[PDB]
Design a protein around this ligand. Structure first.
Ligand SMILES: O=C(O)c1cccc(-c2nccs2)c1
Ligand SMILES: [Cl-]
Lengths: 242, 242
């Protein structure tokens, strides 16, 4: 139920890159990747952790709903879109770390740990700062593990309210047209080597769902756009999107 | 509160057509239209009725959720996409009338009439056949009334569970990208004169929401693409979308 398609490596080599794309066909219950080993290598989730962090904040009432405004703390930061008020949707859209670091502080060490165990999330280890462990702490998760987690989310099978899971899946909305819907989240781990970029989510089709999880060596922010572009090239090759 | 910009009539007359666009700025509580009379003229809702119909079906348990499969009855119809199994998402996307006719029959006359009054939906008159009144029956709704209904749906203020409204708003998803999300529903009314096409919904921005409701003369199916094409050009012109 796992095949290695090394031809996808071209899509990484065309861009002088290195990484893995993992695809999962829900209907066929069958997985596909260019590199099974990197597919099972666990990394810092970085801002892909904003998915579980959102679920937990919502289910605990830290976030009332997707319209609640989280006021800028007035601290100017070097990402302009962070220096403004946000709600859950825009916070996820722009990967606003400081808003989610506030979520985590209010969640707390004990509840965060208990919830990630309930989620069976990666290595379930939050060692480090309660408000940065997913950027430079001990938590690790692989691409195949990201998919497993996402499959539960898609099916409302995580041990949080159906409402919390619906709200996050709405916040995850990235792209939709007449051919498909993508709900996903980007990630960018920089504080601890190796620097990598993430893209995890799923593609909704009329008759199937293709879960995906990719990470790639990201020495500089210059190549961040390759997270989505390389994934789409593979999706296009496998005839999943036009 | 309202403003009429007759100039916008060019959007319709340049395609040898006539119609109305109605825009509502949620933040400013302001409305805009090319034609005040036609914005308050009531037409058959046709497939835009699948919004309230889905809400009622879900809230009464006629539809369990957006994953439940409604099996094709094996009767070949002239729309290829209708000759398939469907769920709430795809039945909305393809305006699968026979799936929603079965919804109505199970909903029943009494509960249907009573929910439409609860919704304050159009003239609230289901006279005709319970499985087709929104096609050739007595119910009517205007573009402004469509907006009054959608705004309640957005704010989860309709008299159904939040879950029912979230699910229906998920099923309304039409387009999403880095700039805006459109949730909407198309309509096409041919059984009573005048033949018209609908497009109703809203566009979600980072800092605002714009509700829209449009209908336009549709003497043949050739011009159905204009329902969304014209609307988006008004949105671009008003700089609501790039
Ligand atoms: O992709 C992401 O999740 C992400 C998260 C936070 C910051 C960034 C940055 N983008 C440019 C320079 S730092 C990206
Ligand atoms: Cl959605």
């Amino acid at each position: 139920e796992w095949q290695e398609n090394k031809s996808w490596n071209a899509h990484f080599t065309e861009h002088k890159s290195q990484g893995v794309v993992v695809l999962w066909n829900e209907n066929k219950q069958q997985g596909f990747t260019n590199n099974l080993k990197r597919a099972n290598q666990a990394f810092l989730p970085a801002s892909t952790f904003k998915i579980p962090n959102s679920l937990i904040a919502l289910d605990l009432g830290v976030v009332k709903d997707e319209h609640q405004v989280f006021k800028w703390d007035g601290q100017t930061r070097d990402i302009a879109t962070w220096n403004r008020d946000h709600n859950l949707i825009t916070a996820m859209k722009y990967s606003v770390v400081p808003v989610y670091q506030e979520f985590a502080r209010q969640i707390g060490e004990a509840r965060m740990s208990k919830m990630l165990h309930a989620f069976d999330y990666g290595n379930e280890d939050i060692s480090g700062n309660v408000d940065s462990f997913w950027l430079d702490g001990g938590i690790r998760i692989s691409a195949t593990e990201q998919i497993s987690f996402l499959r539960k989310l898609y099916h409302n099978k995580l041990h949080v309210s159906e409402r919390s899971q619906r709200i996050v899946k709405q916040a995850m909305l990235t792209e939709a047209n007449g051919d498909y819907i993508i709900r996903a989240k980007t990630g960018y781990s920089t504080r601890i080597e190796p620097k990598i970029g993430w893209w995890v989510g799923w593609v909704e089709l009329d008759d199937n769902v293709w879960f995906f999880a990719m990470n790639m060596d990201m020495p500089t922010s210059d190549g961040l756009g390759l997270r989505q572009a390389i994934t789409k090239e593979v999706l296009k090759q496998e005839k999943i999107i036009p």
